[PDB]
Design a protein around this ligand. Structure first.
Ligand SMILES: O=C(O)c1cc(O)c2c(Cl)cc(Cl)cc2n1
Length: 274
């Protein structure tokens, strides 16, 4: 069985406890359909969501058995220094895939050149990017809006401390002005930041576009605004010498063409009524 590694990241992967009898609660979408779930260890737990639906579709069309587990260190994966040395090694899911603890990463893993040098990405199953969350009525054109480009205590914007977004802004010389402002207001978690916008304590939250659209679709007082920026995509991760490489991509392309990927978006991200 293929060792699948994933991570808790709503709405792509939800993680909940099993019921008293060890099974996963039978639930259904507002649409009325049965929610597909799988046991993922990390203690057996219940995993479901956009990427789980995708894994199932792949497992079925490619005919392969699998077992899912949650990444041990709870990280997506970046190259960090080990034991106070200059030697660096991948942590998170990147690290588990390279070490053999996993044979495939199924999660919203952002595609980028640094990672592509060590592993192989399938064709993107969904595009990725950042957007801005604000309270309904607030007007912001995007990352180039005046109130973002020229910071002041009058309009507070931020992201999550030590997150991929925070690290990205910190490394861009061109964003130094925005970063100096953000570092003063960054939050401990995305949940707290989102709540701060609802409570009018944070005026704008910069974060993953799918996550923010998910939030806006359920909370009437919140909306995303401006054009998506710093784009890329999410892909399935596998070692370079993987035998499922071409087959995973061919399947993803077919799912794009037949409307399946859009169906997943409608189900897990774009909710009807807020
Ligand atoms: O490093 C990553 O791949 C990464 C990192 C992140 O921080 C991600 C967030 Cl908030 C949301 C989603 Cl849907 C995917 C994310 N991926």
């Amino acid at each position: 069985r293929l060792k699948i590694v994933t991570i808790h990241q709503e709405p792509f992967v939800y993680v909940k406890p099993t019921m008293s009898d060890g099974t996963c609660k039978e639930e259904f979408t507002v649409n009325g359909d049965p929610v597909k779930k799988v046991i993922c260890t990390g203690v057996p737990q219940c995993c479901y969501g956009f990427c789980i639906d995708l894994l199932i579709k792949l497992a079925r069309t490619m005919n392969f058995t699998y077992e899912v587990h949650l990444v041990a260190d709870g990280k997506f994966g970046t190259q960090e220094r080990v034991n106070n040395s200059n030697k660096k090694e991948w942590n998170g899911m990147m690290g588990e895939l390279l070490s053999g603890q996993a044979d495939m990463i199924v999660a919203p893993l952002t595609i980028n050149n640094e990672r592509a040098q060590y592993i192989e990405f399938s064709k993107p199953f969904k595009y990725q990017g950042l957007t801005i969350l604000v309270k309904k009525g607030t007007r912001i054109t995007g990352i180039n809006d005046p109130r973002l480009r020229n910071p002041s205590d009058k309009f507070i914007y931020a992201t999550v401390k030590q997150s991929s977004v925070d690290i990205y802004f910190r490394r861009q010389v061109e964003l130094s002005t925005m970063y100096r402002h953000m570092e003063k207001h960054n939050y401990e978690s995305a949940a707290e930041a989102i709540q701060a916008v609802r409570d009018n304590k944070l005026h704008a939250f910069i974060w993953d576009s799918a996550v923010l659209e998910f939030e806006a679709s359920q909370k009437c007082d919140l909306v995303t605004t401006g054009e998506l920026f710093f784009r890329s995509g999410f892909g399935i991760g596998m070692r370079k010498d993987s035998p499922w490489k071409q087959n995973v991509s061919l399947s993803i392309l077919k799912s794009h063409e037949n409307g399946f990927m859009e169906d997943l978006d409608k189900t897990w991200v774009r909710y009807q009524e807020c």
